[PDB]
């Protein structure tokens, strides 16, 4: 006789797993994370995330963190904003961490729900609608700091070269850096000079993030950089993604999580489309451009498959792209990306995919 059992772990190794955050916008109270094996397209499991969930995997690979909002009766009753900690292998709920009722409700940009490099703090965006950054101490399971210094700023860019530091983009067109102490409270902060003109050349918030610097692309196809090799962030730019031929056809960037960086090579990947004009900044990719960030020149261009978001795995030299429903898997071990497969129907309405971390 067969017997149905539960308690099982995900059937594929962590290193095969990717996380497609399905907003399910048509039924946004039933958002969820779909877990897939990128090597073969197999669906491995899922984590429910209620209304407009956000997700990330712990840097050590052991846990999944979600952020969501509940109400006692969904559309009425008391609000509870939370972070949840889930076991990554059993895909089971472990702990709820209470947040103040102002966690960002919005589309799944990476920078709205992040963590420190050391993994000890979750760093999340609030909007009430006044903005601030919230800090969750994972070990304590507590909301421990509210960075009001970040009012008027948006999104969290961790610094991979420091244990508990991150940056945010401010309304002055500069960056605010926050260094947290080992208690998760702000230990110090600094503000950069103006990097970009908010009015004249607004940047997309998505970083192309290196170990000690970050690049940003603008609505008009320029590139700005923030170097955080030192305590003070040094900013520069613009250089243009575009040559004269590109400009003639009005190529500009577009998408959501629209850039990535391959750290070993310095290649930056950007979704681009022709016939750019006001209002096209979220258009699907006609192409992916591959830029050498050292020479500040394009090295390759490939079809974009209508992608809107991407993510990079450094150690396996992979790029995923995502068109809202389907995930494309590319090998980026050489300058021209090679399409390996497409996972069809990975989500109904996803703008974010992420790899399971393997780098510890």
């Amino acid at each position: 006789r067969e017997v149905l059992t539960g308690g099982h772990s995900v059937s594929a190794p962590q290193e095969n797993r990717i996380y497609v955050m399905d907003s399910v916008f048509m039924h946004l109270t039933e958002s969820r994370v779909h877990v897939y094996d990128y090597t073969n397209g197999k669906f491995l499991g899922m984590v429910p995330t209620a209304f407009n969930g956000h997700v990330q995997v712990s840097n050590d690979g052991k846990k999944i963190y979600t952020m969501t909002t509940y109400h006692e009766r969904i559309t009425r009753g008391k609000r509870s904003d939370v972070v949840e900690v889930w076991d990554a292998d059993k895909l089971t709920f472990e702990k709820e961490i209470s947040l103040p009722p102002k966690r960002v409700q919005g589309l799944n940009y990476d920078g709205l729900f992040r963590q420190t490099t050391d993994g000890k703090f979750i760093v999340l965006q609030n909007a009430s609608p006044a903005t601030s950054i919230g800090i969750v101490d994972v070990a304590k399971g507590d909301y421990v700091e509210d960075v009001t210094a970040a009012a008027g700023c948006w999104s969290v860019i961790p610094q991979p070269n420091r244990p508990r530091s991150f940056m945010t983009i401010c309304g002055d067109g500069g960056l605010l850096t926050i260094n947290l102490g080992e208690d998760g409270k702000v230990a110090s902060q600094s503000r950069s000079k103006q990097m970009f003109s908010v009015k004249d050349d607004p940047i997309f918030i998505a970083p192309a993030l290196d170990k000690d610097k970050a690049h940003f692309v603008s609505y008009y196809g320029n590139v700005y950089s923030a170097d955080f090799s030192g305590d003070e962030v040094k900013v520069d730019g613009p250089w243009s993604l575009l040559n004269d031929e590109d400009k003639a056809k009005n190529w500009v960037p577009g998408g959501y999580n629209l850039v990535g960086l391959h750290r070993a090579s310095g290649r930056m990947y950007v979704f681009m489309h022709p016939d750019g004009k006001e209002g096209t900044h979220k258009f699907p990719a006609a192409e992916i451009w591959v830029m050498d960030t050292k020479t500040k020149q394009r090295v390759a261009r490939i079809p974009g498959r209508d992608a809107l978001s991407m993510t990079i795995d450094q150690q396996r030299n992979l790029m995923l792209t995502l068109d809202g429903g389907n995930v494309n898997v590319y090998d980026i071990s050489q300058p021209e990306p090679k399409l390996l497969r497409t996972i069809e129907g990975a989500a109904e309405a996803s703008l974010q995919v992420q790899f399971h971390p393997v780098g510890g």
């Binding site: 017997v3 059992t5 539960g6 669906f43 499991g45 899922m46 984590v47």
Partner: protein, 109 residues
Amino acid sequence: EVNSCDYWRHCAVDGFLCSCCGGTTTTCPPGSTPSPISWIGTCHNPHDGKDYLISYHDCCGKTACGRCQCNTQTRERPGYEFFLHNDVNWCMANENSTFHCTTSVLVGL
């Protein structure tokens, strides 16, 4: 073949096949909980020509899997023959009744 609605063991599945949802025909996907109760189907085995009892336990406590939806009705009967009936949530008595997917557990001849 087990991921197809026409697989012989699935003859009274109304739901999403757990084998398409990160589980198998006899194991719940990670983090979903078996139902202790089920509807039962009698399905014809196309190999040996014999009929087998299949227990359709649901997996529960996660939102709808959404993959491999089936609605097969061989020997299914209405709610006045309750344990032959598949238009109810067999997660109804679980600690969390949210329906995730349906398994097809072979009981015997």
